[PDB]
Amino acid sequence: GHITFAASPAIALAALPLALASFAREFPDVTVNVRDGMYPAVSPQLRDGTLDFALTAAHKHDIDTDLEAQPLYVSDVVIVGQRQHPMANATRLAELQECRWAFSSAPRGPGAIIRNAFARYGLPEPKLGLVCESFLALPGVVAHSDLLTTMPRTLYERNAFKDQLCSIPLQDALPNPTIYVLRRHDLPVTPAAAGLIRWIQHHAL
Ligand SMILES: Cc1ccc(S(=O)(=O)O)cc1
Ligand SMILES: Cc1ccc(S(=O)(=O)O)cc1
Ligand SMILES: Cc1ccc(S(=O)(=O)O)cc1
Known part of the structure; x- marks a missing residue:
């Protein structure tokens, strides 16, 4: 049992x-x-x-x-960055294309969600800033950098760094x-x- x-x-x-x-x-x-x-x-x-x-x-x-x-x-995937991020108010993936990313885990490999997102819109590859496979570490890493990342909305809502993070109000599609x-x-x-x-x-x- x-x-x-x-x-x-x-x-x-x-x-x-x-x-x-x-x-x-x-x-x-x-x-x-x-x-x-x-x-x-x-x-x-x-x-x-x-x-x-x-x-x-x-x-x-x-x-x-x-x-x-x-x-x-x-899933509901969100793009997340420190609260005062230059791109905090962005609405389109093309606006993020020069940002550096914390590639987070995904079934097809680190950063696969954002790489696929950029690809589907005919953008160049997202810039790799760091690979962070740990969803436990990720919110604090993003909160202490200008890296953007993707994460499930639940983790964005439920981490100890949420007052230092924001979610990017994207109007382009993300492959959930x-x-x-x-x-x-x-x-x-x-x-x-x-x-x-x-x-x-x-x-x-
Ligand atoms: C992108 C992404 C979406 C959802 C999850 S999971 O719900 O925690 O397995 C992990 C990674
Ligand atoms: C926590 C942390 C991780 C990575 C960087 S960065 O490589 O300078 O963007 C800065 C800060
Ligand atoms: C509605 C809804 C569905 C799924 C998620 S997520 O699991 O945090 O990606 C959050 C919110």
Whole structure:
């Protein structure tokens, strides 16, 4: 009666605590073990059965045949910079094209969201200022620099540096990844795991 799973940062910050509280009421005899995990790194842990499932951004098409991918929702990606950033008031990606970026993690590699965003608008590649794979470190790094970055809106709202950050009110499109449940399709879904996932969906809305 154990559930071991991984959760992505957006999930970890809002949905997870509320979900675990609702779930402990409904299934009080289940022991939960939760860890950090993003796609692709969770893939072999799901594959070998160390994780029962993982809640993470991913793209349907990159995902091994072993895994099924139940979409839960679409992420809300924001561009974030220190509060007085020269580009704080920008509305178009072309206006950011000379800024330096903290490339943050994403399923297709560090900085993949903003590189793809710039590409889709026929812009040149965004300038690399630094690679920061740690969503825990990222808000404080951006707050102490003039680097821009992308992050889920939940992390922008829930970090200890939020009074020193701003979100860029972009009117151009950003390629928001979809948040999936990832699990071996050959693994039957226990009532408890299904219950916990439904709670994370319910609270993440
Ligand atoms: C770009 C991006 C990175 C990570 C996530 S998260 O997996 O929801 O925390 C969503 C969107
Ligand atoms: C925290 C931090 C990280 C990186 C830089 S920068 O490379 O000069 O933009 C400045 C400050
Ligand atoms: C509405 C909405 C959906 C998703 C997110 S996010 O998970 O923080 O990217 C924030 C807000």
